[PDB]
DNA sequence: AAAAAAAAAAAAAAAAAAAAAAATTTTTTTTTTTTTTTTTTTTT
DNA sequence: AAAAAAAAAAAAAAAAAAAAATTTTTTTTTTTTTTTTTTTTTTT
């Protein structure tokens with residue numbers, strides 16, 4: 001019921017405390033379901049099955065069945081939340097009385113609060129009220145331990161001053177010891193205390209929602225005991241919490257308006273491997289067109305460059321790493337370099353790889369890089385803790401670093417990427433950190449040739465500004481020429497304009513994550529083995545290719561290329577999800593490796609090799 | 620050989636950690652001085 | 664034999680003495696960061 005006094009004082013009175021606690025118990029037990037299920041029974045069943053420590057309830061259901069509580073909720077949320085903690089504790093103990101050891105506490109979260117305010121507009125009129133809001137996490141410190149029921153050693157006599165509850169507002173302070181009667185220098189008993197997880201995030205208004213002439217505004221937020229690490233930086237998150245002012249934040253200091261900071265005790269944060277995967281992946285792997293389906297599922301937002309779609313497929317699935325003895329580093333990573341004249345989807349390719357492949361990061365030879373190739377240690381600014389920011393490769397240790405504009409990286413990045421793909425370990429020796437972080441990168445890269453146009457007369461090495469050892473070890477070199485042509489340009493223009501009209505704001509092969517599950521399955525679980533290839537055929541293949549390449553200015557095919565051939569064979573076997581490499585796979589790996597080698601070779605020699613080796617490129 | 624560009628050095632400014640600096644009378648006890656009362660010893 | 668002086672013991676009151684007692688804030692220091700100058704190094 002209602003009276004002249006305020007809502008908060010009302011709900012503070014004991015009579016209505018029992019009233020609303022009874023009402024919460026009542027609808028917890030009785031609000032069966034939309035369609036007669038008693039959903040609270042099943043929710044509590046799962047809650048205690050995992051020991052989640054936290055229930056969540058829908059505000060629409062709350063208000064619809066019992067509306068007085070819903071109206072009271074934003075007015076004096078703290079008191080209602082405490083009582084619902086107690087009532088939920090009662091009902092969960094009723095369902096499972098064995099729960100008593102489990103945390104002695106249940107939190108309750110409220111979802112779908114109808115009235116969302118915007119971080120631009122949170123005024124005095126929302127203090128001490130439960131609001132709903134949206135934003136992006138700009139920072140999120142680590143999980144810290146907070147006092148929740150603290151016991152103090154009176155260090156005059158070592159009496160254990162009993163467990164004081166710790167509100168978020170002001171630090172608890174014992175008056176005196178019940179034994180020796182001193183307000184002594186008390187100090188926390190580290191053990192008998194039962195702490196509580198504390199994490200501090202900072203959300204800000206999303207640029208997609210910020211207005212024209214503006215700076216997005218940022219509100220702090222505190223996560224406690226179950227929601228810590230429920231959201232990482234850059235996550236678009238809805239936040240529901242008690243917008244809050246009265247803790248100790250106030251500019252009572254000199255030189256300041258009497259102006260208060262604010263926080264949000266977050267009461268609900270909402271962001272915005274498997275089984276049967278073997279079944280689906282193997283069932284489609286039966287099809288045996290799966291190689292071309294993968295080749296046509298890789299990079300659908302690009303036209304042409306089928307050679308590079310295939311090549312990046314082989315780079316994505318990789319080979320296998322081996323070490324005969326503890327003496328020979330032979331690698332499973334297939335490194336790729338697109339070299340292309342401008343405006344030919346190099347960065348488009350790279351961003352597709354970043355989107356699709358797990359443990360992918362992006363980096364640029366220029367200084368605009370999100371993540372850097374070098375490794376450095378400093379005090380990271382948004383956290384101000386002294387990190388070892390290990391570079392881009394190490395951060396992409398398993399999967400892919402993607403080096404866009406590979407042809408302009410500063411000489412330090414040249415040194416670092418060379419030493420990465422050569423050693424496969426990045427050797428840091430800056431402050432006192434003389435270590436070697438292993439970097440099993442699978443580098444993809446893009447490079448614009450000299451003069452902004454590919455020059456078929458000169459060779460690849462001398463018309464791209466990447467020095468010989470760097471250009472060598474890349475398992476695939478691909479050339480991208482923007483050759484003017486009627487039908488090609490017609491097709492490209494029609495595709496682009498179709499995308500544009502489709503992407504007007506009025507209109508608002510295998511799927512990509514299907515391919516991603518395929519990627520991890522065939523990258524870790526499946527290791528095709530090789531005793532089933534015409535060893536003599538490939539040995540004579542190297543013989544014939546190098547024998548033709550014997551000439552001046554004709555740096556020949558070598559063992560680098562023959563091991564790259566085996567890597568590509570394994571990769572195609574992986575791609576076929578087989579457990580044994582087959583002559584078909586060996587033929588395809590031969591085809592792609594030889595295509596890469598001839599197109600590396602300049603025009604006249606390219607035509608000689610193409611004419612005399614068309615039998616393999618025929619397949 | 621001199622000009623342009625880049626890298627490193629020098630110097631000022633800021634943020635946090637941890638060691639220093641400052642404030643700071645009132646109530647209870649209990650010994651000592653004084654008085655008082657009952658008794659015994661001595662004198663009229 | 665009665666009166667009285669003295670003795671010891673008991674009590675009240677005033678002066679002196681006894682005892683009790685962590686917390687908050689400020690400042691130096693260290694350490695990085697940033698700007699701008701100077702220096703050095705690469706180019707035509």
Ligand SMILES: Nc1ncnc2c1ncn2[C@@H]1O[C@H](COP(=O)(O)OP(=O)(O)OP(=O)(O)O)[C@@H](O)[C@H]1O
Nearest residue numbers: 301302303304341342343344345346347348349448
């Ligand atoms: N084959 C293609 N299919 C689709 N879009 C393409 C293709 N070739 C070029 N484009 C378009 O060209 C534009 C430039 O693409 P991209 O970012 O890859 O440039 P680039 O050639 O790598 O240039 P740069 O050297 O400046 O990085 C993008 O709009 C991309 O869509």
Ligand SMILES: [Mg+2]
Nearest residue numbers: 346347404405
């Ligand atoms: Mg590009």
Ligand SMILES: [Zn+2]
Nearest residue numbers: 154157177180
């Ligand atoms: Zn004590």
